[PDB]
Amino acid sequence: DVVVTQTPLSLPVSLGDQASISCRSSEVIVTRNGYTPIEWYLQKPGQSPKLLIYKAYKRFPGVPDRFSGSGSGTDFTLKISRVEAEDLGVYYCFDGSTVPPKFGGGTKLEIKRADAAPTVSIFPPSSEQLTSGGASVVCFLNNFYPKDINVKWKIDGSERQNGVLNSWTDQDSKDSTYSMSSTLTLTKDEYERHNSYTCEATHKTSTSPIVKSFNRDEC
Amino acid sequence: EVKLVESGGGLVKPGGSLKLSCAASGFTFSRYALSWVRQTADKRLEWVASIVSGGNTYYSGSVKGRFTISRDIARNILYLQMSSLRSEDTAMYYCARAYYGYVGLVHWGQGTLVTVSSAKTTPPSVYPLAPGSAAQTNSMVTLGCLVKGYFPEPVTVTWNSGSLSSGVHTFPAVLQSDLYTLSSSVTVPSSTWPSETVTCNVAHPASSTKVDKKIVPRDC
């Protein structure tokens, strides 16, 4: 059986720079002149995967000449001469030397951009939701870079490290930034036993956290 | 032009069966190898099966004996009969044609969604996310909609029927207690809302749901 290990999982690169993605099959492929079943695919955000390279080095029509494949034995790598914003997406290699063919785990190509602090906005539960007996406090941290960010909640001053879920958008297609949502969920009862709710976030762009909060005692 | 459209996806309970279809056009159907490839949540791609011009079929071991790939050269249709479905079979299924011979996979269809679970189909609850007043005096204002408790995926969200494209962030759903919840935020100039109407449009085809929710300020 063959197992294809693709690296890295995420590849950050500046526009204009070179990018290199590696795939290693657990089985050495044969052929220095007799065809090589190594293919490369790219799946753009929200789209279906598409063929870039086949036979290890041939470019499918439509694929920019910036892309090129190379390899020998167990190692194969896809290369981009100089990255364009258009290359954002997930790239996958494919080893078709045996049945069944195997795909590499995929490499997320991330476009580097200047650092940016998030725009934080907190939101109390809708009156409609309280009527139904539920209480979710939502917090948005939008348009920041890099992706890693710290989000700590505080209720009347006490950190709340439970009941808080997260979700992150993929790299923005317009500005290359990342966005994140954090949702603290509770029952109407639980929610009403306190008045002070805080969404605190510390991002690498500043040592001092960005605090955004509200008190039930207001609108 | 070469075209391939998958169909037949839906919710199915473990142990059940479902047959997927892949309608083709724009090429001599009989001449090419056709394959089904699936993609799971972890965004991982998994080759599932293929059938070549000569009639031979091939399957991945995790699917052999359960899934049956077949084609009707007469009606230009490719199929994938699934049986003894397992939770791990949940994924987006695409069909793709060989570029030539049995080389490459091109013109992938948009794919059809298959969800294997015992959970029932339930609509989402839509809640408005409005500013807790706060004078603002700021150039931009951020609004949003919390879409809670639905199943199965997916749910689409638009604002003002698509009129508001910029400043939109729709977050990926999270599965909690076999129920999905996601959110969407939109950011417009303070001179746009509340003077003009801002409505999020939520869709949940599974439950034939199409709901509109107007964001109104929290009176003070």
Swiss-Prot record, chain B:
It is found in: Cell membrane. It comes from the Eukaryota. Residues 119-215 are annotated as: CH1. Disulfide bonds join C145-C200. Coiled coil: none annotated. This is Ig gamma-1 chain C region, membrane-bound form. The chain holds residues 1 to 102 of 393 of the full protein.
